[PDB]
Design a protein around this ligand. Sequence first.
Ligand code: CLA
Ligand code: CLA
Ligand code: CLA
Ligand SMILES: CC1=C(C#C/C(C)=C/C=C/C(C)=C/C=C/C=C(C)/C=C/C=C(\C)C#CC2=C(C)C[C@@H](O)CC2(C)C)C(C)(C)C[C@H](O)C1
Ligand SMILES: CC1=C(C#C/C(C)=C/C=C/C(C)=C/C=C/C=C(C)/C=C/C=C(\C)C#CC2=C(C)C[C@@H](O)CC2(C)C)C(C)(C)C[C@H](O)C1
Ligand SMILES: CC1=C(C#C/C(C)=C/C=C/C(C)=C/C=C/C=C(C)/C=C/C=C(C)/C=C/C2=C(C)CCCC2(C)C)C(C)(C)C[C@H](O)C1
Ligand SMILES: CC1=C(C#C/C(C)=C/C=C/C(C)=C/C=C/C=C(C)/C=C/C=C(C)/C=C/C2=C(C)CCCC2(C)C)C(C)(C)C[C@H](O)C1
Ligand SMILES: CC1=CCCC(C)(C)[C@H]1/C=C/C(C)=C/C=C/C(C)=C/C=C/C=C(C)/C=C/C=C(C)/C=C/C1=C(C)CCCC1(C)C
Lengths: 95, 151, 174, 162, 80, 33, 216, 138
Amino acid sequence: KFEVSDGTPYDLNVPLVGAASFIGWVVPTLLPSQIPLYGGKGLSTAFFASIGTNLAKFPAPPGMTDPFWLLCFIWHSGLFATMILGSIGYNGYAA
Amino acid sequence: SQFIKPYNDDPFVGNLATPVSTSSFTKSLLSNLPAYRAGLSPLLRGVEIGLTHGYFLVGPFYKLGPLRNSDVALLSGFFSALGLIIILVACLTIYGVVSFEETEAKDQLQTAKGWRQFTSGWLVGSVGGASFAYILISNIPFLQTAGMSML
Amino acid sequence: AMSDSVPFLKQPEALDGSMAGDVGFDPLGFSSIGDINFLREAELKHGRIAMLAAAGSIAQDIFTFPGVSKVVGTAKMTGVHDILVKQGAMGQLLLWLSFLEVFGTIALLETLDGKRAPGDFKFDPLNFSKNPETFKRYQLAEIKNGRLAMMGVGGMVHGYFITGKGPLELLGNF
Amino acid sequence: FGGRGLGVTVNAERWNGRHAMFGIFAMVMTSYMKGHGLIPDADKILDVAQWGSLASVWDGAGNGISNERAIILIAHVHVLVVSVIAAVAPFGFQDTLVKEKGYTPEAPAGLIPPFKTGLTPEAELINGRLAMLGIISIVTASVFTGTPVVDTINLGMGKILY
Amino acid sequence: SHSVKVYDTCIGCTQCVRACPCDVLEMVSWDGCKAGQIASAPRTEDCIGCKRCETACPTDFLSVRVYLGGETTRSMGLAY
Amino acid sequence: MTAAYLPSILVPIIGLIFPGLVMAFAFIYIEQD
Amino acid sequence: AKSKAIPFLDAPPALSESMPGYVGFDPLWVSSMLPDAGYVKFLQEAEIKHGRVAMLAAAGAIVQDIFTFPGVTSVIGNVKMTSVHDTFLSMEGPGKGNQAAMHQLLLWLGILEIATSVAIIQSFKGETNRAPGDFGFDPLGFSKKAGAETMALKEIKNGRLAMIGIGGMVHHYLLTGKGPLQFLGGIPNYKSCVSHPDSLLPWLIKPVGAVLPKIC
Amino acid sequence: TLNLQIPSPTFEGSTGGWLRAAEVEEKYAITWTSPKEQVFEMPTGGAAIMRQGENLLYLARKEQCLALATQVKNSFKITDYKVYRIFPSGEVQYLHPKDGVFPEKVNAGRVGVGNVSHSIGKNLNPAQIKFTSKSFNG
Ligand code: CLA
Ligand code: CLA
Ligand code: CLA
Ligand SMILES: CC1=C(C#C/C(C)=C/C=C/C(C)=C/C=C/C=C(C)/C=C/C=C(\C)C#CC2=C(C)C[C@@H](O)CC2(C)C)C(C)(C)C[C@H](O)C1
Ligand SMILES: CC1=C(C#C/C(C)=C/C=C/C(C)=C/C=C/C=C(C)/C=C/C=C(\C)C#CC2=C(C)C[C@@H](O)CC2(C)C)C(C)(C)C[C@H](O)C1
Ligand SMILES: CC1=C(C#C/C(C)=C/C=C/C(C)=C/C=C/C=C(C)/C=C/C=C(C)/C=C/C2=C(C)CCCC2(C)C)C(C)(C)C[C@H](O)C1
Ligand SMILES: CC1=C(C#C/C(C)=C/C=C/C(C)=C/C=C/C=C(C)/C=C/C=C(C)/C=C/C2=C(C)CCCC2(C)C)C(C)(C)C[C@H](O)C1
Ligand SMILES: CC1=CCCC(C)(C)[C@H]1/C=C/C(C)=C/C=C/C(C)=C/C=C/C=C(C)/C=C/C=C(C)/C=C/C1=C(C)CCCC1(C)C
């Protein structure tokens, strides 16, 4: 019974929108590229590999020239765009 | 499906009911804050608010003050926080002196006795929170370096 | 009024005691924030995955399938994952579990409407739960073994992170 | 102002008497601790590189506050913080510094209140007026003779402290 | 409040009353001009002091005059 | 400087305590009915 | 209305005689410091927890003198009262060492203390009519026994006594370095002081030399 | 007499409406009758639709009410509007038109307030009336 306003009950559909937007953004971004930023992997997989690499170096943050920041920014930008569009499509149309 | 409605179902009041202003999350957070939470004396509202604000007041004075590169940086930062707390308590006192008439009602913040109780609670909470932050930063090297001790 | 698991705490409002394993254990009040059915479906999925992982850790200590020792060598548990990411077994597992979990997402949509019990996938080919009493006893056993398995998998993988042996080898070579 | 217990009131007389009794005690204890050398590194000059520009005094040698003076000031800072908290958040039983507008003023005790010995307000007021007069006399005897105030106390108590 | 005066040079053209945004002025009966009417200011507690009435007045130097005085909530035009 | 303690005593008082008490009491005076 | 412990002082207004161990002793009116109804309950709960912790301290301070668990002295040596906390923490931490004893204690006690925090919040607001300090922990059924109507009084009294006792023993270790039983048996304790490491708050022992006598 | 049960124009609300001083010091009300539902501009900003029949609306200032009255007079030919002042106690003070006749029309019974019986050039000098309670008009 989440009210989005004073008297406006609205279903946020956070599980569906989150899961569907995550899958619909991650799966197309599994397309590989041979550029050094990706390293032979897709955008999502290069991002996850960079997460593992930098978590193997805790305290020490990723450097400026490290591909982690660019991978994180592009991946989260596309994810946020997918989440916004998925929220619009599922909450509005619902069919 | 409209998300913005007139405030309190009154279209001529100077406010709008918005998701930032009137959602369930906003209403729960605002009604659960110590300044608005039901069942609290004004003194205990003051205690909670003072604990929070006085606790976080130590940090900027300790890390950025003129004595920040000295061995007495934390002591100076706590003393600066205490001086700011005393100044703000004087501000609270003069606000309550000029703002409220002497009434029997004392269970509300916006009464003279209620504001005096709130000021007393805010002073005691602010001193306690600042002292707690002083104790924790004095005894934990992680807080002294803001995490750089791990490197 | 008071909880059974924690006697000095008021009973959670969203916990009626109908779900299996309900002893009124919610001191942080997570069922007041999140939906109880979403949390139950999450608990059952985490617990079933943990049951499979615990039994798999023990059996992979006991024996390996033919030809596995050619590819993995002496690597055990977590050490297998990376190797079989390169060989391709983990990719196939990811693909087919993701395919099943698409229909699991549709099942989550069914249970969030109130039209499906959490964790119910109607999967009883052998008709073990033909008696509703045996069904209740099996639900309690499933949720208890799932939570115990979550604890077990935590212990096994962190013991492997410490010693590099594995569950049964640590039980032997302690 | 006057309706709150400030100015020439019996409330202000009582409060200044309490503070003056404590002040006589603090001066006697300062003379005792300084005479026996119980203040650590009392002649150490505090350095600006550690304590900042607030330690600067601009005397003829050292340009810094002595460690004993800083220690005495910090001892006063403790009871000043106690003072602020007691003035804003007093004990429920305690006499308050500022009084409510519709308060009943305590009657002036005249030349001398009734002779109630013990932990009575009359004994408190008598010893408070006596302590205020003693502070006046000690200050005047110090500035009309050049004897330091700790030394003036030590002679007036007959070198008992040191 | 502001003070509004009407002098006997008024010709009763009713322009100042029509220009008033706050309903301060009104026309009353008079015999001093050909129109048979003169402006009056019975409600100067609502006067904001905008001097639109003086702008509307056509007589060489004005018949209606506004003298700004003590400021109130109404005269300051405060909606708060 | 003779009586070198006097600047360090009086400058913080005159510059922080005097204006604070003046501003507080003037605030009370100008806002009271 | 005057206090029973202090017959000339007035009785504090917030004490009702309902709580066990009341003798009218609250001269600072701490129980009247908050007008809220649950506040006194909060106070009592704090007292109970203090006493219970102090009891577990005091017995521990004795028993750690009598015997030590196997392998402990091979890890930490001959430290006795508060240098155990310091020595373990010196050998605790990822990278700093291999022990985790005080951190494990902090973890499980913090789980218990969060679950206790929820109960204190519930009893403060009045959503629960549970007594302060009551966790329902009576597995051996002593409440259904005989003489159980005075057990709360013995609990609060031994709690306060253990509070004072552990304050005693800790401030004794900070000066002599002995520990409780050696301090009790070595009655002139300033003639033979065991050398001990400085605590993690060494500044607090600074005035002992200059300001204070420093007999030891 | 202000009927509090008169329906209001359909408005979606705005941040330009009345503040706490309306409920604490004084508030203003304007009523009018329209022959049809039609869109007008709010004096506080925004478009509202007045209903067919009677309309009651609340504002913070008298000038806002009279601006709305001028707008509905010159754009919709509505002249029956009435402006009231309402106090927190519930007292309603009828304001405009004060005697039922608009102030630009002469009505019997009106008495002249602030009328001076000479031209503006015949006022007294300030030095004439200094230290004296005489008015500058004479
Ligand atoms: C980023 C991914 C994405 C995109 C592009 C769309 C696009 C669309 N969805 Mg949709 N959807 C998505 C994710 C997305 N969806 C997800 C994750 C869910 C599940 C929660 C849904 C669920 C959903 C439903 C249930 C329905 C739709 C519908 C629609 C269509 C009209 C409504 C709309 O949003 O128009 C958006 C209009 C445009 C995108 C075209 C304008 C182009 C401009 C430049 C904006 C584009 C921004 C940017 C370039 C996008 C970059 C994407 C990023 C990942 C790189 C439109 C084709 C409805 C329909 O009719 O389709 C069947 C409908 O019924 N969607
Ligand atoms: C003539 C007035 C005057 C005086 C005497 C000072 C004095 C000082 N300022 Mg300064 N300041 C002033 C005007 C003044 N300021 C003005 C007008 C501005 C605005 C441009 C500033 C802006 C300013 C900044 C931004 C900073 C200072 C700082 C400092 C401190 C110097 C560094 C140090 O060692 O601090 C060491 C500090 C301490 C040991 C803490 C002292 C705490 C005091 C004693 C508590 C007093 C409480 C309060 C006044 C009680 C009365 C309340 C009542 C009036 C209602 C020093 C206390 C710096 C500082 O350290 O601030 C603390 C600093 O960061 N000042
Ligand atoms: C761990 C601290 C602690 C706490 C929280 C309490 C709490 C309580 N005690 Mg208690 N008590 C304690 C330790 C404590 N006790 C110990 C160690 C003893 C043995 C001496 C006693 C002996 C005792 C008696 C004999 C009685 C109580 C009573 C009470 C209750 C009334 C409120 C009160 O007096 O609390 C106030 C005390 C505290 C909150 C403890 C902290 C100390 C305060 C905050 C110090 C104030 C700060 C300030 C710096 C002042 C210090 C200097 C000053 C003395 C000059 C309350 C439930 C009464 C009761 O329940 O009657 C049935 C009662 O009659 N207590
Ligand atoms: C539903 C469906 C059915 C299906 C089914 C499925 C296949 C059911 C299969 C289920 C199995 C996987 C349940 C597994 C539980 C594992 C846990 C409880 C044991 C955890 C170990 C812990 C205690 C530990 C560990 C310990 C520590 C941590 C580390 C070690 O050093 C030591 C140690 C080992 C002691 C079937 C097919 C029958 C048909 C039916 O019609 C319907
Ligand atoms: C709840 C209940 C039960 C429970 C239980 C158990 C857990 C109860 C545990 C209780 C503890 C052990 C009681 C300890 C009291 C300690 C004080 C009285 C002595 C303090 C030290 C003195 C003052 C001293 C000191 C002294 C000075 C200062 C310095 C030294 O040189 C000398 C010396 C050492 C003499 C159970 C589980 C059975 C079940 C039941 O269903 C429910
Ligand atoms: C390739 C690539 C890139 C990329 C990229 C791009 C552009 C990504 C595009 C992603 C898109 C278009 C995702 C769409 C997802 C739609 C979903 C999951 C719909 C779900 C619908 C549902 C659940 C409806 C359910 C329903 C329900 C319950 C109720 C009614 C029925 C129904 C409607 C069926 C770059 C450019 C970043 C570069 C990178 O190197 C590689
Ligand atoms: C573990 C650890 C540490 C630690 C620590 C600890 C545990 C230190 C100390 C803890 C505590 C709780 C000290 C208590 C002192 C109590 C006093 C003085 C009570 C006086 C009571 C009186 C006078 C009663 C009077 C009385 C009253 C009220 C009622 C009437 C009767 C009468 C007798 C008159 C460190 C700091 C060393 C650091 C290290 O790295 C880690
Ligand atoms: C990070 C987070 C994520 C993003 C979003 C976000 C929400 C905006 C953000 C939050 C940012 C902010 C909002 C984080 C929230 C922050 C605030 C500042 C935390 C304040 C805590 C105060 C406590 C610790 C002091 C407690 C008192 C102690 C126990 C005292 C004992 C004392 C008492 C009096 C008795 C005497 C003893 C002593 C010791 C003197």
